[PDB]
Amino acid sequence: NIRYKKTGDLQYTITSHAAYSGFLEFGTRYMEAEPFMWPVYEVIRKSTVEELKALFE
């Protein structure tokens, strides 16, 4: 249930559609966090910026 959509012009939104997924990303009153989208944010940020640079360098 991880998906993405072109929600606007030059705008793509990724979404984890499974209802409990926040409880996994952030942990809970009973569970440690097991973050899974944050570690990908750290990757795709770099790739996106450097590829947009390479479009103009």
């Binding site: 705008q11 979404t15 209802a19 997924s21 989208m37 947009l52």
Partner: peptide
């Protein structure tokens, strides 16, 4: 509850 998560890339 529908505790979905989003990430968005836009230019």
């Amino acid at each position: 509850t529908e505790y979905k998560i989003k990430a968005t890339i836009e230019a």
